[model samples]
Target chain A: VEELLKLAKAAYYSGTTVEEAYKLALKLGISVEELLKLAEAAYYSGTTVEEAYKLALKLGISVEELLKLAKAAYYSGTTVEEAYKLALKLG
Target chain B: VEELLKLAKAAYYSGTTVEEAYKLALKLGISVEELLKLAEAAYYSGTTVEEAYKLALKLGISVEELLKLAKAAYYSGTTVEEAYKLALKLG
Candidate 1:
């Protein structure tokens, strides 16, 4: 968990684009799906949802990545199953 | 930023005690000053650092939220401006 957070923060601070952050997440062993969720969380932190989506796009993360983030953020601390269901509905 | 990352994750997962996380932080090599530095960053993401400090005692986050969370995440980010600082160095 500590390592995961470090990777997340490194991605946040690294001069690299959001896609680079996803690549780093992959290197850190985060599944692509999990990386998308974590990246969305990190991007939305201290910034707007639109900003997060824009950055995700700039990094070449897929639209699905943005959807995952919006869903996760909307349903944070809840079950992923329910969150994903809602994400589909909302998106 | 080393153990800062650790404390952030521990607090994030522990579920009961942000203070416990902070106390655990004290056991590590970090200063109290650095505790807030790490905590704010963790709190702002996925959950607001508002959640982070709120899980603590009444002596939690102050209202002068920083303009940039990069300032909240890195201790050095606030050193240049003493007053209105979010993460004050150890007195």
Candidate 2:
């Protein structure tokens, strides 16, 4: 997990694509799926994994689910709280 | 109704304010309420009242309700058809 975090932190700062991150993850012999899941969270949260992790933890969702809520807020023009309401309805 | 339509067409083409249209409506001794209603329709569609009138007639809704549907589509980032579905849900 820490290894992937290191890769993702570098990818996030460099404005690299998820595809690029996935390529590096392949080199590190990590699961391709995990790279994207963490990369998405880091992408939206300003490379601050803690803030992203903290909220996802509070919401009782995986970091992957955090990506959906962020996308809902993005498309709906609402904060996470309201976006979560729609997200629950949508799911 | 024709005179009011004329006033609306003029107001729309010039990009006049709804408040300005209301003042003109008063001079014609027309209903203040109706001026805003038609003005809103004209505002959302082009200055072309016929086109605005055309779609609204088919919808079986007043031009005012048309405004709501237009707004719904606008806020939801969808076309009128999708937006109309949301408007129906909201009401």
Candidate 3:
């Protein structure tokens, strides 16, 4: 967990996109979806590591879907409302 | 409009909470609802000034309700899904 955390932080602070971090985390035993939630908490929520893990468990989205949401939100710079609207279209 | 924009930017970049900025915008002839949308676009979406103004007109929510949505989303650190759920409760 500690190693994964360091890797994630380095990827993020080093300007690696969340998608890249997600891939790295998957290579290191974390699931893509779980890593996406962690990345969301890191980049968007400013959550602590422990809290982010908890948040990921609480969110209940698959990595594939969450990846799409996160990417759209990141790229489009949409508000929560706009992001939600996009998510709804996915469902 | 230009004056209000400057005030809004100052309030936001200077660390004024969105709520405070919303109040100031209301006092400066912008509606609370309109300012909330602008704030969301600025803080969350990173939208351009002109686009934010256009978005405010397009959203069509009242100031009172948008205030509730904005406050909850800001405080809870929820993703778009969670934020949308909170908005649904208001309706």
Output the better candidate (1/3) by TM-score.
3
lDDT, candidate 1, B1-91, per-residue tens: 7655565555654443556767655564455444554454444433434343443223333322331333333422222123123223211
Q: What is the interface RMSD, in angstroms, for predicted model 3?
A: 11.8
Off by over 4 Å in 3: A1-10, A13-34, A43-50, A56-91, B1-10, B29-91
Give each model a TM-score: 0.21, 0.33, 0.27
User: Which of 2 and 3 is the better model by DockQ?
Assistant: 2
Query: C-alpha displacement of A53 in model 2, angstroms?
Result: 1.2
TM-score of chain B as predicted in candidate 3: 0.36
- Candidate scoring better on TM-score of 2 and 3: 2
* Order of models, best TM-score first: 2, 3, 1
Can you tell me the DockQ of model 1? 0.03
Where model 1 places Cα greater than 4 Å from the true spot, the runs are A1-8, A11-37, A40-77, A89-91, B1-91
Residue-level lDDT of model 2, residues B1-91, one tens digit each, is 2333344344554366433654666654555444555556555543443454456666677756877766655566665556666666888
Deviating ranges (above 4 Å) for candidate 2: A1-10, A13-36, A45-47, A89-91, B1-91
Total clashing pairs for each candidate: 4, 0, 2
